[PDB]
Write a protein that binds this DNA or RNA. Structure first.
Lengths: 313, 313, 313
DNA sequence: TATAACTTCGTATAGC
DNA sequence: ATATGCTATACGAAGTTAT
DNA sequence: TATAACTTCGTATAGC
DNA sequence: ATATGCTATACGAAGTTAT
DNA sequence: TATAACTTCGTATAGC
DNA sequence: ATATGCTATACGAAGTTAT
C-alpha cells in the first residue's frame, strides 16, 4: 500500500482526475502490486504476459467482466500517464480481454442492475408511511418521492440545497440541479412536510436532507450532507419494512439500493408508452444507446401488437 | 469439396460455432478453393493480394456487399482460428473492401428487405380464409396471425411446442419463447381452431404446427418440425393466392417470405406512433440502431408536422 | 493561392468529390500553405510534427474543435489521395487531436446550434404578416411555413420546382423531394397565395421561390434559384422584424438562420411526445443517434414523471 | 444616382 | 461517455442589377 | 452504558 | 450483435456521536 | 402412377 | 454518415412419402 501509495503521489494535479477515480487507481494498484509480489513479478512498468495472467487471475476468482475491465483500465492509465505503452496495446492483453468476455457472453453472465422501485412500490410505501408522524419517516418518504419523481442519483439528491427549490405551475416544487426538476403536487406536499418539520429552510444554504438522530432531533446543515451510504440505507430499510430481512445468499440487489428509483421510474415511463426524448429528459440522458441499455429489463410486457390488432389501444 | 471438407474437419468442437455458421464456412471455402484452383493460387494459408483479387472477382460477378463481407469473414476466421494473420489485416484487403463499398454506396445498391405483410394484408387474407374449412387454410391463417402478432422469426415459430402456450387477460394465448408473447383475442381464436382440428394438443410436446398432406390429414409431432422452407412457402402461397404467380425477373422479394410479417408489423407499429421501447419489446430488439435500421423503409408517411400544425393530432 | 490552386487541379474527376468539399479543401490548403510559408515548413508532403503544430496554431487562435477537425481532414485527404500516409496516422497528430478535444470537453466549449424558429415563433410571425399585401411578405411567410412544416434544408427549399407540388387528403400540398412532404391546410394556403401572386406556376419548371425586386416585381425562373444566402436573410429579416437589430457581440445565432425552422420543429415534435420514428420521418433522418443529437437542446421540460404521478397525462 | 434585394465568396463550423 | 469523413449551413462583405 | 443513526472505507461493479 | 475510459453506486464492516 | 406437400441443400444475402 | 462477426432467412431445385 504505502509503496503503492507514495510511488503514485504525483500526477501533478490530483484535480487531473476525480477523487472517485484516484480511489479506484489505488485499489487496482494495490491489487496488482500484491499479486506481482506473491508471484514475483515486476510491478512497473508492467509486462503484458504478466498483465494477461493477472486478469486471468481475476477471472479465475469470480470477478465480473466489468471489474476486470476496471483493473485493466487503471493499469492502462498508469502506463499511459507515465508515458509508456498501454498494456492494452499488447497482443497478449488484447487477446485475453476477448477470451474472457466470450467466456461469459457465452457463460450467460451479464451485468446486474438494482432492484426497481416502481410506482406500485412507491404507492405501497406511502400507504404505510404517509400517516407517520415520525421525523425519520417524513424525511425518507420525501426522499423516495424525489428519487422516484426526479430519477436523480443519490449523490445529486444529497447535494440539493434548500435554495435550489422554486415553484411552478400549480405550486409544484422546482429543483435546480447544477437543469430543473419538477415535482408533482403530491411529492411537493411530502417534501414540504419534511421541510416544515425539519427546520432546514432556516438557512437556505442548508442541504434539503440531513441526519435525524435517535432523539428524533434533526440537524440541519449547509456544510455536511447525508452520505450516499445513508441514502442507500433508506432504500434498504424501506425494503426491509415491507419484506423483512434479506437471505444470506450474499448477492447484490436483494433489497432496494440507491438506483432502485431511477431504474423503476425509467421502466414505468417505458411501459407507459412514453417517448424516448421524454424519457431522456426525465432522467437527463443524452445518448439513446445509454438509455435503452439502462432500460434493458422492461418488466411488464406492453402488448403494442395486441393493442394494434384489437384496435383497442 | 472433399479436400475443402476433410481438411477442415477439426475446429475441435463443431459446437464451437453454429451449424448455420459451419455451413457458410464450407460454401465460402469451397468457393475460394475452386477459384484458387482455376487461377492457380495457394488456398491456405491465403495471400492477401489473392484474397483481394478473389473479392474483386465476387464483385465483378454481381454479388452484394453483404455476400462479399461474408466470404471475407469466413476467410478471416479460418486464418484466425488456425492462428494466422487475418486477410482482413492486410492493406490490400482493407483497401478493397473500402473500394468495393464506396463503389455501391455510390452505385445506389443497398440491402433489400422482404416484402411486408401488414395489417391490411392480414385483414385481406382473413377475408379470404377465415371461412375456409380446409385444414391447410385453418393452419396457415393461424400461422400468419402468430407471425404478424408476435413478429417471431420462422425458426422460432417452427419450434413452438403446444406446452409453450398459456392464457392471460381475457383468455388470450401466451406463447413462451425460450420471453412470453401475447396474442390478441382474434389471433388466439384462429390458433385455437388450428389446435382443435389438428390434434396437436394430444401430446403437449407436440409442435404447434405440423404437416398436412394432400389427404388433408394432419400429422402432429413432438420430434419433427415444419421446415423453415415450408413456412416460407405458406407466405409465398398466400401471396400467390391474392396476386397470382410471380414474374420471372428472377429477383428476391417478389412475393411474401419468412420476414414479411416481422417487417410489416414493425412498420405498422411505427406508422401508428408507437414508441421505440414498445416496438423493441414487440419484436424483442435490444439495440435501438438495429431496430431503426430494420424499419428503414417506413411506408406510409405520418404527417407529425401536419398533425402538430393542425393541432389536430 | 495560385500555387495552392494550380498544384491541386487534378484529382482527375472534380466530380470525385462535392463542389462544397473542393471549396473546403482549397481553403484549408491555402491556410496550411500560408502557415508553412511563414514558418518555413514543407507544405507537401506534410510532416506530422508540423501538422501537429499547425492544429495547435488553429486552437491557439480560438477555432472550434469542428474547424480544427476540418483542416485536419482535408489534410488527411490530400495525402490519402496522393497515395501517402495520413497525417492522422501519426502518433503526434493522433495525440494532439486528443489533447485539443479534452482541452474543451473540459473547457466547456460545445458545438453551437441555430436559434430555433418554433411554432410560437411561426404563429407570431403570421400574426404580423398574414394580412400583408406585400409580395415580399407573401413570399417569405410561405417560405417560413414550408421551412417549419417540412424541416427541409435551405438548399432543398431553394430547389423546389413548381412541378414538384401535388395535392393530397383535403387538398393539402405535397412536395416531392428528389421523398414527399405534406403541408397542413394553413401552410398550403400561404403557399397558394405566394403562387397565385408570384406567377411561378406559369412554367412548371419554375422554382417555387424567386427574387422580388424593390419594384415588388417578381421574377419567376426555371434556371435561377434564390441563393441559400437569400433564404438565410429572410430568417434574419424576420428576426429583425420582431426584435430589432442584433448586438455587435459578433457571435453566431443572435438571429434566426437557415436551420432555425428545422431545429425548432424538431423541438416542437419532441416536446409534444411524438415518437422517434415519426420525428425521424418528419425530418428525413435515418440515424437515431444523429436525430437525438440534433435535438440535444430540447427547450421546454416535459414533466413525463409529473404526468405519470398525477396520472394526469 | 442610390438603393433594395439580391448573388458571390471565403473562413468558420454544424450535421448527416 | 467516445473518432473520422464528407457535405451542409453561418455570416460579413464585396459585387450586381433594375430601379 | 448501549445504541441508533449515522460516516468512512475498501473491493466489486454498474452507468454515463 | 460489438471495445475502452472515467465516474458512479453496492454493500459489509469498522469507526463516531449524542443519546 | 402422379402428385401435393413437404424436406434437404447450396449459394446468396439480410439481421442481430 | 461509418467496419466486422456470427447467425438467420431467400429461394430454386432435387429428393421423399403417402397418397
Amino acid at each position: 500500500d504505502e509503496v503503492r501509495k507514495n510511488l503514485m503521489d504525483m500526477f501533478r494535479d490530483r484535480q487531473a482526475f476525480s477523487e472517485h477515480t484516484w480511489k479506484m487507481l489505488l485499489s487496482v494498484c494495490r491489487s496488482w502490486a500484491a499479486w506481482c509480489k506473491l508471484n514475483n513479478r515486476k510491478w512497473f512498468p508492467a509486462e503484458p504476459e504478466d498483465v494477461r495472467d493477472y486478469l486471468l487471475y481475476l477471472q479465475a476468482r469470480g470477478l465480473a467482466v466489468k471489474t476486470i475491465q476496471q483493473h485493466l483500465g487503471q493499469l492502462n492509465m498508469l502506463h499511459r500517464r507515465s508515458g509508456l505503452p498501454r498494456p492494452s496495446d499488447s497482443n497478449a492483453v488484447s487477446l485475453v480481454m476477448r477470451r474472457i468476455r466470450k467466456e461469459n457472453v457465452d457463460a450467460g453472465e451479464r451485468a446486474k442492475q438494482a432492484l426497481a422501485f416502481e410506482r406500485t412500490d412507491f404507492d405501497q410505501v406511502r400507504s404505510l408511511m404517509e400517516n407517520s408522524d415520525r421525523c425519520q419517516d417524513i424525511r425518507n418518504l420525501a426522499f423516495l418521492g424525489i428519487a422516484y419523481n426526479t430519477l436523480l442519483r443519490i449523490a445529486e439528491i444529497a447535494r440539493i440545497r434548500v435554495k435550489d427549490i422554486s415553484r411552478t405551475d400549480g405550486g409544484r416544487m422546482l429543483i435546480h440541479i447544477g437543469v430543473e426538476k419538477a415535482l408533482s403536487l403530491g411529492v411537493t406536499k411530502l417534501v414540504e412536510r419534511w421541510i416544515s418539520v425539519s427546520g432546514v429552510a432556516d438557512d437556505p444554504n442548508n442541504y434539503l436532507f440531513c441526519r435525524v438522530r435517535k432523539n428524533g432531533v434533526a440537524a440541519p446543515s449547509a456544510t455536511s450532507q447525508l452520505s450516499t451510504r445513508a441514502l442507500e440505507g433508506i432504500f434498504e430499510a424501506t425494503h426491509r419494512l415491507i419484506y423483512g430481512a434479506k437471505d444470506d445468499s450474499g448477492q447484490r440487489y436483494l433489497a432496494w439500493s440507491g438506483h432502485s428509483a431511477r431504474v423503476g421510474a425509467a421502466r414505468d415511463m417505458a411501459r407507459a408508452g412514453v417517448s424516448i426524448p421524454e424519457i431522456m429528459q426525465a432522467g437527463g440522458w443524452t445518448n439513446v444507446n445509454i438509455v435503452m441499455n439502462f432500460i434493458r429489463n422492461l418488466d411488464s410486457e406492453t402488448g403494442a401488437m395486441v393493442r394494434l390488432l384489437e384496435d383497442g389501444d
